[PDB]
Design a protein around this ligand. Structure first.
Ligand SMILES: CN(CCC#N)S(=O)(=O)N1Cc2ccc(Cl)cc2[C@H](C(=O)Nc2cncc3ccccc23)C1
Ligand SMILES: CN(CCC#N)S(=O)(=O)N1Cc2ccc(Cl)cc2[C@H](C(=O)Nc2cncc3ccccc23)C1
Ligand SMILES: [Cl-]
Lengths: 299, 305
């Protein structure tokens, strides 16, 4: 019993965190094999190729724990700087670079000065921002998932937006969202609720004994989406329905049966009640996170 | 900016997790130097749990009865002793990944990270608090026994909890790393229930100061209160009594934001009376009590918005 916002064990990622200093800017780097990846804004109308050509290898100071790593080359890939170092990381885990879709969740190892300070779970919002917890010096912190023994790196932190939400790139330097790495007027678009994730969390509640919101009714996918669109909920697709299949079979509650429950919660609210200790409908647990937490998958 | 329930990086603890098997039972152990710590109930049958005589069950065991597995390697048990509700298995190999550590007993209201494990393998990390009724609201399945709670302030791991059992309401009970249970609980399948829980008042206040730091003051009012009048109101909402110690501990947050603890106490009184009225505080529609005054100072900025 119990349902918590749970992160992946961070140990395989902690062994990769390094400190990168270039002039007045100090941020975090990800050391994998003989390359250190970090936001290209550590070199900082920024013509990044023109600013980079001026720099030499010895301008970039890289620190791994108490040891100074020696930079032997440098190249840029989109909004990420790849610093070739003299020493390969002995703690390099089995890894992949993956780009995630909005609604997908991941673990963030927040770092300052190359030292990990905390780990938390979060989701890529439909508006491509993340609601993280970061202070100045957190740039270069990474987001990841673990599938068996392989670490899938999916996010690298770059900046904070005026509303407090965060923006960054995949590990190939491509931003999530219509954002750019510079000091300019940019804002997060209007956000929406991740519908498939709220449904998964309603199934997690049923598994833990919270059945007060169940009703005798069902709905069509079209009628559910007509209602969902009016409450700023993401459209629910046939793919989402198929993905919720296992949870539907386990609890005995059809996805459109549970959709009628969500429809009633949207028009009437909770009425003094809570679901899994929450007075709000929670959308930062995917259908897979619910299955993994209510089965005990290890790493 | 931002306010998340944040756990400590679990790596220093992951390199300590081992699998302990005794007969038909299998749970987790904490391998520190040449000793593996685990719940003593690994030696029990399901039957034994009604009235187990651990001393009598332990005398019947030898070192080779306890199978210890660290990753793909079998560790050899060379001794065993019991300390309260924890079994200490002396092993032949010292853990090379042993971090700098201390065993600390925490008080209710204190927070800590839990590395949930199954079969000696870590599966997740989460943050939680020792409730006033000495239980924890964890996320644990069968096989999670022996999972540990810790804090990593600076470079030292402070082990404060080892998981032992799930109570009938879904809440969890366990011991410090010396085998002393938190609460009036026993490692016995007896009729035992968690006492009525209360809200950790000093933690809700800390979280209200964290919201002011992040630029939110909608909940404040022009009123103040005496500590006694605040507690007369707080008790009526199942809130823990706020002591002068709690007021002293909130001092730094009070000075940083410019709001007196008893004035913050007056906003809390108003929030209990009126509810939130469609509004949220740090993304929450409930008053949050699982962030201590120390966690707020750690996560939040030193500059108020
Ligand atoms: C105006 N600033 C951001 C504050 C806002 N709104 S800044 O400090 O001058 N900033 C400018 C800037 C411009 C482009 C890029 Cl790609 C990055 C950056 C930096 C940035 O965003 N850093 C941060 C990340 N994450 C969290 C933070 C929290 C606080 C303060 C900086 C945080 C610095
Ligand atoms: C009646 N049981 C509790 C489950 C409930 N409600 S049990 O499964 O027979 N249980 C009895 C018992 C009695 C004393 C002690 Cl110290 C330990 C134990 C064990 C225990 O508590 N294990 C678990 C821990 N943590 C989480 C769990 C989740 C699910 C299932 C076992 C979980 C076994
Ligand atoms: Cl304490």
């Amino acid at each position: 019993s119990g349902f918590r916002k749970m992160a992946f064990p961070s140990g395989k990622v902690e062994g990769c965190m390094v400190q990168v200093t270039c002039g007045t800017t100090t941020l975090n780097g990800l050391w994998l094999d003989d390359v250190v990846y970090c936001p290209r804004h550590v070199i900082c109308n920024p013509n990044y190729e023109d600013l980079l050509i001026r720099k030499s290898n010895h301008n970039f100071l890289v620190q791994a724990g108490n040891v100074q790593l020696r930079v032997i080359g440098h190249s840029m890939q989109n909004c990420v700087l790849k610093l070739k170092v003299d020493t390969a990381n002995p703690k390099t885990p089995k890894y992949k670079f993956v780009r995630i879709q909005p609604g997908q969740t991941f673990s963030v190892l927040a770092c300052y000065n190359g030292s990990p300070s905390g780990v938390y779970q979060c989701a890529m919002r439909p508006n491509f921002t993340i609601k993280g917890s970061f202070l100045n010096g957190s740039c270069g912190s990474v987001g990841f998932n673990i599938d068996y023994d392989c670490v899938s790196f999916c996010y690298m932190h770059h900046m904070e937006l005026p509303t407090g939400v965060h923006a960054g790139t995949d590990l190939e330097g491509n931003f999530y969202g219509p954002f750019v790495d510079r000091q300019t007027a940019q804002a997060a678009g209007t956000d929406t609720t991740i519908t498939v994730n709220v449904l998964a969390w309603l199934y997690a509640a049923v598994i833990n004994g919270d059945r007060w919101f169940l009703n005798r009714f069902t709905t069509t996918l079209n009628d559910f989406n007509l209602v969902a669109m009016k409450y700023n909920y993401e459209p629910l697709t046939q793919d989402h329905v198929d993905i919720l299949g296992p949870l539907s079979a386990q609890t005995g509650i059809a996805v459109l049966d549970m959709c009628a429950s969500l429809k009633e919660l949207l028009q009437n609210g909770m009425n003094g009640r809570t679901i899994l200790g929450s007075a709000l409908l929670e959308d930062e647990f995917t259908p897979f996170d619910v299955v993994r937490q209510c089965s005990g998958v290890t790493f």
